[model samples]
Target chain A: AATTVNGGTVHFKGEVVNAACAVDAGSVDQTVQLGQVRTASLAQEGATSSAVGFNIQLNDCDTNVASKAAVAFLGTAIDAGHTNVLALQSSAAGSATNVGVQILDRTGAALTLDGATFSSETTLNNGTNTIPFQARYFATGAATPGAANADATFKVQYQ
Target chain B: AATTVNGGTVHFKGEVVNAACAVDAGSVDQTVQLGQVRTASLAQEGATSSAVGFNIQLNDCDTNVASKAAVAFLGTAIDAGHTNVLALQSSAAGSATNVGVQILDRTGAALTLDGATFSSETTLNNGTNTIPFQARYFATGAATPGAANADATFKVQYQ
Candidate 1:
């Protein structure tokens, strides 16, 4: 039987140091809903559900502090086989099986978890800036019925 | 019985990134010997043994990269009661009881463990430069003899 639990939210947790810009309040502790989907939709290996858009906005950036900035997504990789996939919440009730969360850039390319090299960098605009990213459910094996949810933290590096 | 298993050495470990100066090979993986001390010498709380001098030298510094540099000592502080004391090794055989290691600057001032603000900074030289420091056995309670040794890593920060 296909399991349908409550809607899932991917909570992003992060910390800000003496970086080039201040993260907008909306960007910190941000949550993106992964609306309910039928387990059959992602039953095939490497199958992906619909991607949802999210963003991290930066403001009050000082060019004196840094001229360029990049975002590094941090999280526990699903496993050795899936370096870009974020492992689903194992302790959550009705935890999903064989499916994880994969983050993507605006161009739809998967971003590596805790990557030393940033996926993208942006030139500082002095005031406000928006960095777009996406996330989706990714299947490592045949997806099973359960709640599919995961979270990741991100740090903005400036130079 | 005051246990004196053998002479103890504090092993300093650290990592280097894209900093202003390169840590001398001798500076990395440094070992400082704390010769045998009688437990009775530090039988009272707040007693300290003789100090031993050490150096963490920096070389090939690029003035353009940074002109000022400081070292941050990293380790677990003994406890809430002794914030500056580096905790003795618990996994080590015959680990010392009631005594820990305390680090000091060249002037013999005790340094804070994992301090948010650095203890001191030095102007960089393009060639070799030596940063002097010291360590000594510190008593937090009535001393009971064992192997009185502890270690801490350090990172050189530049500005």
Candidate 2:
């Protein structure tokens, strides 16, 4: 005879740091207007809204200090199925259900939220460099109509 | 000869960036306790309280990236007579008068508040480096007793 057991879960914590890069003042504190997204348009699972483009400018970057740089966006993430999706704060007023924010690189590839590992890194220039990115509203599940607002903080790592 | 005129003033704005170095988490935000001092002790001009030492620890500092580092302490400074003294926020309630905070390097020499030009820069090690500094309350004139609290922000520049 054999006994049956249910699935279990494991939790852990750690940190990773890379070479330094000068983050421009404008890129320090930014607020991206994601615009008004429609719930009906995202009724289907895996649906996404138009990508809004933004840039994190790195200025006075010296090649001697670092020749390459990457970005790691930190935030309250969604479930494991969508690790790249940032969760909307549940405590926020009129929070939208089953919707999240997704960040993508220049090539429309989603960067990982795991540690300091950036999926794609960009080469740095001597004076200033602009790292372009996009953010889109993602339908994690059957979308529930409400206000959708989420935020993420990013750190620029150099190599 | 015509009537003699007094010296005028000049104001400007600029910024500076240095090489890459990882600042330790603990060193990012620090608070140093300057123990209570009697008003009489700070009566005479130029009199100072005992130095309160603090450290800004830099970790994961790769010599391949950069070999040396320096610090520029930025704040609202006292008049030219004491350029190194950081002014206590006047808007603070019960703010002290004729008193300011002064920062000192390892040799007890005051670092100039002038631009990106740090008076002394330290060589970086392969790993962690602890940059030690001291702060003290100085009497600009006959000290007026009140809260002597002050704050200063710093930037670490790499070579």
Candidate 3:
């Protein structure tokens, strides 16, 4: 019997980062747990947020190349406006409306979204470099509580 | 105006299958997106898998109750002694980690998981009942470079 194509489309993404730094061991397999927050908190705090931290470590750098490497985060944004911010749609869509994600640099500045790449301008060291990052819910609307999740893949390029 | 903090306890399921299966229009908000696989695919084809198809819908579910329900497929199992096969570990450390997911029907047919449920099980004079399900990736050692993500958060026990 012939098969049904499931009537669908296909897509994919990958990167070849010379990577002066390496994907942090834990971060590679890391799960960013936003934890539970009262949906009321979002309305109360405008963008009520929480922190789940992760890092990328650049090690044994050749200095000649690894030095000053910039990191660019990559992933599909749920919508055009959120290229910089993450769109962690609720697993149960209608429930968590107006909810999105915002990843922050160690210093707590919002990354500028450019084609969904949250790039890091910080430089790397010859011995070891660490790109520290944090994330939280970017509550844009009076959100209804539910499951929220999003994933990202990245690469490092030398400046 | 006072309230008692009296409570037995709270519990919850962290399975992906319960992600509000489009109870309304806004919920079908997305797709499981297995993408692509050849129809010649077979269960034992070593690292082989295909979407058997899976969907969740809430239809003319009459309710003497709240009239709401859900269905969850527990996913694959691993290691010896476990009857249902598990998925391959991304860690690349364990054996038979290259497992796959097989969904079941109303009566354990095709896949081994279990029958999809409309828990409220209320009868409707003409309500339509359907479980749209399709799963892929029963990876074996020979499994090639492929994306195998096994992430699910189900209702742990009725939170």
Which candidate leads the pack in TM-score? 2
Residue-pair clashes per prediction, in order, are 0, 0, 29
Pick by lDDT: 1 or 2, better one: 1
Weakest 10 consecutive residues, lDDT, candidate 1 chain B?
B87-96
Q: Per-residue lDDT for B1-159 in model 3, tens only? A: 677787797875332343223343322433455554543353344455545565554433333424344444454455454334545444564333244554433444433332332222322222324544455555444443344445332221111
* Candidate 1 per-residue C-alpha lDDT over B121-151 given as tens digits, one digit per residue, 9 for 90 to 100: 7777788888888888888888766665555
**Weakest ten-residue segment in model 2 chain A by summed lDDT:** A13-22
**TM-score against truth, every candidate:** 0.46, 0.47, 0.46
In model 3, where do residues sit more than 4 Å from their true spots?
Answer: A1-19, A76-83, A90-95, A115-120, B1-159
In model 1 chain A, the worst 10-residue window by lDDT is: A117-126
Which runs of model 2 end up more than 4 angstroms from their true locations? Answer: A1-82, A85-159, B1-18, B90-92
**List-wise, what DockQ does each model earn?**
0.01, 0.01, 0.06
For residues A12-58, could you state the per-residue lDDT of candidate 2 as single tens digits?
Answer: 63332233445666666566655444454566678986676778786
Candidate 2 lDDT tens digits, B15-85: 11123455554565667888777888888889998889999887556687778888888777778788888
Q: List the residue pairs that clash in candidate 1.
A: none
Error of 3 at A104 (Å): 0.6
Candidate 1: stretches off by over 4 Å: A1-159, B1-16, B90-93
Query: What is the TM-score of chain A, computed separately for every candidate?
Result: 0.83, 0.81, 0.71
